[PDB]
Design an enzyme around this catalytic site. Structure first.
Site, PDB file in Angstrom:
ATOM      1  N   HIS A 258       0.820  -1.205   0.000  1.00 50.32           N
ATOM      2  CA  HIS A 258       0.000   0.000   0.000  1.00 50.32           C
ATOM      3  C   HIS A 258       0.857   1.258   0.000  1.00 50.32           C
ATOM      4  O   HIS A 258       1.700   1.452   0.886  1.00 50.32           O
ATOM      5  CB  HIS A 258      -0.943  -0.024   1.188  1.00 50.32           C
ATOM      6  CG  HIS A 258      -1.961  -1.118   1.088  1.00 50.32           C
ATOM      7  ND1 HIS A 258      -2.163  -2.051   2.078  1.00 50.32           N
ATOM      8  CD2 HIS A 258      -2.799  -1.454   0.077  1.00 50.32           C
ATOM      9  CE1 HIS A 258      -3.112  -2.891   1.706  1.00 50.32           C
ATOM     10  NE2 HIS A 258      -3.515  -2.551   0.492  1.00 50.32           N
ATOM     11  N   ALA A 259       0.605   2.107  -0.991  1.00 46.59           N
ATOM     12  CA  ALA A 259       1.530   3.174  -1.356  1.00 46.59           C
ATOM     13  C   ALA A 259       1.825   4.111  -0.191  1.00 46.59           C
ATOM     14  O   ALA A 259       2.976   4.495   0.022  1.00 46.59           O
ATOM     15  CB  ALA A 259       0.975   3.966  -2.562  1.00 46.59           C
TER      16      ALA A 259
ATOM     17  N   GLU B  79       1.768   3.648   3.044  1.00 51.16           N
ATOM     18  CA  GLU B  79       2.280   3.042   4.286  1.00 51.16           C
ATOM     19  C   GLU B  79       3.810   3.076   4.288  1.00 51.16           C
ATOM     20  O   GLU B  79       4.478   2.045   4.242  1.00 51.16           O
ATOM     21  CB  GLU B  79       1.708   1.624   4.447  1.00 51.16           C
ATOM     22  CG  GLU B  79       0.168   1.675   4.574  1.00 51.16           C
ATOM     23  CD  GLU B  79      -0.540   0.330   4.495  1.00 51.16           C
ATOM     24  OE1 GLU B  79       0.109  -0.730   4.613  1.00 51.16           O
ATOM     25  OE2 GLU B  79      -1.778   0.344   4.321  1.00 51.16           O
TER      26      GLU B  79
ATOM     27  N   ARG C 270      -3.193   4.732  -2.173  1.00 50.38           N
ATOM     28  CA  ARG C 270      -2.996   3.361  -1.654  1.00 50.38           C
ATOM     29  C   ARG C 270      -2.820   2.317  -2.747  1.00 50.38           C
ATOM     30  O   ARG C 270      -1.953   1.437  -2.661  1.00 50.38           O
ATOM     31  CB  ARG C 270      -4.237   2.889  -0.889  1.00 50.38           C
ATOM     32  CG  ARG C 270      -4.498   3.496   0.437  1.00 50.38           C
ATOM     33  CD  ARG C 270      -5.845   2.956   0.954  1.00 50.38           C
ATOM     34  NE  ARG C 270      -5.770   1.564   1.399  1.00 50.38           N
ATOM     35  CZ  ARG C 270      -6.303   0.528   0.753  1.00 50.38           C
ATOM     36  NH1 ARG C 270      -6.957   0.700  -0.392  1.00 50.38           N
ATOM     37  NH2 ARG C 270      -6.185  -0.690   1.259  1.00 50.38           N
TER      38      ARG C 270
ATOM     39  N   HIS D 183       2.958  -3.903   6.730  1.00 48.00           N
ATOM     40  CA  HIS D 183       2.010  -2.809   6.519  1.00 48.00           C
ATOM     41  C   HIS D 183       2.084  -1.795   7.663  1.00 48.00           C
ATOM     42  O   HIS D 183       2.901  -1.939   8.578  1.00 48.00           O
ATOM     43  CB  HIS D 183       0.581  -3.369   6.420  1.00 48.00           C
ATOM     44  CG  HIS D 183       0.385  -4.304   5.268  1.00 48.00           C
ATOM     45  ND1 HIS D 183      -0.360  -3.972   4.159  1.00 48.00           N
ATOM     46  CD2 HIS D 183       0.859  -5.554   5.043  1.00 48.00           C
ATOM     47  CE1 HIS D 183      -0.354  -4.986   3.305  1.00 48.00           C
ATOM     48  NE2 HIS D 183       0.385  -5.955   3.818  1.00 48.00           N
ATOM     49  N   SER D 184       1.240  -0.763   7.597  1.00 44.88           N
ATOM     50  CA  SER D 184       0.986   0.127   8.746  1.00 44.88           C
ATOM     51  C   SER D 184      -0.435   0.672   8.573  1.00 44.88           C
ATOM     52  O   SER D 184      -0.997   0.533   7.488  1.00 44.88           O
ATOM     53  CB  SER D 184       1.995   1.267   8.777  1.00 44.88           C
ATOM     54  OG  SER D 184       1.756   2.177   7.714  1.00 44.88           O
ATOM     55  N   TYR D 185      -1.052   1.238   9.613  1.00 44.53           N
ATOM     56  CA  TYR D 185      -0.520   1.302  10.977  1.00 44.53           C
ATOM     57  C   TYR D 185      -1.417   0.466  11.914  1.00 44.53           C
ATOM     58  O   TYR D 185      -2.310  -0.243  11.453  1.00 44.53           O
ATOM     59  CB  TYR D 185      -0.480   2.767  11.445  1.00 44.53           C
ATOM     60  CG  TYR D 185      -1.846   3.464  11.460  1.00 44.53           C
ATOM     61  CD1 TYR D 185      -2.366   4.069  10.312  1.00 44.53           C
ATOM     62  CD2 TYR D 185      -2.611   3.518  12.628  1.00 44.53           C
ATOM     63  CE1 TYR D 185      -3.619   4.706  10.323  1.00 44.53           C
ATOM     64  CE2 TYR D 185      -3.862   4.147  12.649  1.00 44.53           C
ATOM     65  CZ  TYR D 185      -4.353   4.741  11.502  1.00 44.53           C
ATOM     66  OH  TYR D 185      -5.582   5.365  11.539  1.00 44.53           O
TER      67      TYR D 185
ATOM     68  N   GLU E  86       1.360  -5.000  11.074  1.00 49.33           N
ATOM     69  CA  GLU E  86       0.992  -3.589  10.965  1.00 49.33           C
ATOM     70  C   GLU E  86       1.843  -2.825  11.973  1.00 49.33           C
ATOM     71  O   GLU E  86       1.743  -3.074  13.176  1.00 49.33           O
ATOM     72  CB  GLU E  86      -0.484  -3.392  11.305  1.00 49.33           C
ATOM     73  CG  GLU E  86      -1.402  -4.383  10.630  1.00 49.33           C
ATOM     74  CD  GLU E  86      -1.795  -3.952   9.232  1.00 49.33           C
ATOM     75  OE1 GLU E  86      -1.474  -2.802   8.845  1.00 49.33           O
ATOM     76  OE2 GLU E  86      -2.435  -4.765   8.520  1.00 49.33           O
TER      77      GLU E  86
HETATM   78 ZN   LIG Z   1      -1.413  -2.155   4.012  1.00 51.37          ZN
END
Ligand SMILES: [Zn+2]
Length: 395
Positions: free
Chosen positions: A155-156, A158, A213, A283-285, A357
């Site tokens: 995901h862009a 993050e 994203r 990933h985040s968050y 995350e």
């Molecule tokens: Zn993500």
């Protein structure tokens, strides 16, 4: 983003859920946690970004419908302007700054060139726009080595995830020969590290829209761009918690593996399945370690094992700075969501499959300042090394 805010709302029961759905139908809402109104479960909190022109209407809606809320971020512009606060002054690569794609790409070539006895680089495919998708193999050369696969940057927006894959590689090469566990790890196994999957999206967060994203592929019959790569895999594909509307942030795509990026990842994993013993996706968050399943309320066959491993990893992470993570099956944190890469990898037979995350818990959300990169990566390293040591001893 001047005057934009990020809200957190307490949802108690199904009434609160449909109220948020109605709000989202009335104003354009960017859901931060979870990814869409459709992924919201009872007894949880939900974070979302609101446009400057919509602040009063949204607040009025929340107040008059008695939805309990708080403002997480009072001016997103201030947070965005404060993200680049690294004390490291340079225009080249830094492990303590967020690096643009041109810089990360150059770094993959350089770190490989400098460490040929520990790293090799390949391109496993190209993105929609034609960018090479680089994968680094980290380990001392040897036959029949098991492997752990880790990816970042699905995901862009993050950004801390992309930063973490780079930090991991640095730690692997600089601690080999000096720290006993990493030395054993690289002798006995390989790490396949894919530092940025969604390259076209990541570039877009640097050039046009920090909140982007999805991928940057075109969609038939609409101006809406992109697919959610974590809803694009062949795992109960597009049956729940996603969207068939290309304009939605959770668009599942036109078919499973319709995206060049996700197809390249799935192909690589299938081509290397005998070797790959664990799959880790960053990933985040929100500070969680999740495992299968997300696409259905069913539990994996080795649920007890995965739960215990997650528990131990979370505890190991906390030893450093006291950072608190939660853990469990995907479908216990959000309403079931199909097409995830962690679920897909698991159903391929990869018994250890985890989504991480990272920081934080909503203070800055996706816009974590550079000054927190080091501490975030340091503590995350402990959890990753714990999982690696577990995997090594459970072959
Ligand atoms: Zn993500």
């Amino acid at each position: 983003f001047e005057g934009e805010k990020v809200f957190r709302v307490n949802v108690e029961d199904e009434n609160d859920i449909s109220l948020l759905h109605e709000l989202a139908s009335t104003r354009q809402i960017d859901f931060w946690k979870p990814d869409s109104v459709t992924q919201i479960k009872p007894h949880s909190t939900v974070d979302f970004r609101v446009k400057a022109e919509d602040i009063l209407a949204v607040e009025d809606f929340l107040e008059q419908n008695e939805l309990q809320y708080e403002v997480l971020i009072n001016n997103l512009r201030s947070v965005l302007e404060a993200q680049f606060d690294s004390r490291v002054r340079t225009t080249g690569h830094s492990y303590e700054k967020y690096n643009n794609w041109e810089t990360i790409e150059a770094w993959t070539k350089q770190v490989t060139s400098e460490n040929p006895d520990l790293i090799s680089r390949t391109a496993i495919g190209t993105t929609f726009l034609g960018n090479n998708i680089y994968l680094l193999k980290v380990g001392k050369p040897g036959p029949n080595k098991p492997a752990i696969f880790m990816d970042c940057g699905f995901h862009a927006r993050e950004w801390i995830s992309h930063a973490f894959c780079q930090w991991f590689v640095r730690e692997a090469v600089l601690t080999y020969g000096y720290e006993s566990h990493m030395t054993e790890f690289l002798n006995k196994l390989d790490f396949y590290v894919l530092p940025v999957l969604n390259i076209d999206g990541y570039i877009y967060t640097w050039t046009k829209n920090r909140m982007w994203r999805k991928t940057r592929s075109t969609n038939a019959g609409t101006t809406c761009i992109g697919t959610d790569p974590n809803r694009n895999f062949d795992a109960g594909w597009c049956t729940t918690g996603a969207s068939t509307d290309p304009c939605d942030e959770t668009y599942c795509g036109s078919a499973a593996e319709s995206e060049k990026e996700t197809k390249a990842l799935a192909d690589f994993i299938r081509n290397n399945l005998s070797s790959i013993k664990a799959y880790l996706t960053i990933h985040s968050y929100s500070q969680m370690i999740l495992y299968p399943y997300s696409y259905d309320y069913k539990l994996p066959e080795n649920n007890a094992e995965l739960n215990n491993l997650a528990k131990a990893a979370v505890k190991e992470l906390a030893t450093l700075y006291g950072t608190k993570y939660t853990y469990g099956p995907g479908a216990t944190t959000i309403y079931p969501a199909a097409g995830g890469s962690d679920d897909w990898a698991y159903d391929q037979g990869i018994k250890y499959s985890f989504t991480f995350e990272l920081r934080d818990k909503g203070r800055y959300g996706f816009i974590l300042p550079e000054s927190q990169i080091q501490a975030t990566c340091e503590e995350t390293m402990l959890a990753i090394k714990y999982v690696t040591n577990y995997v090594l001893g459970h072959l």
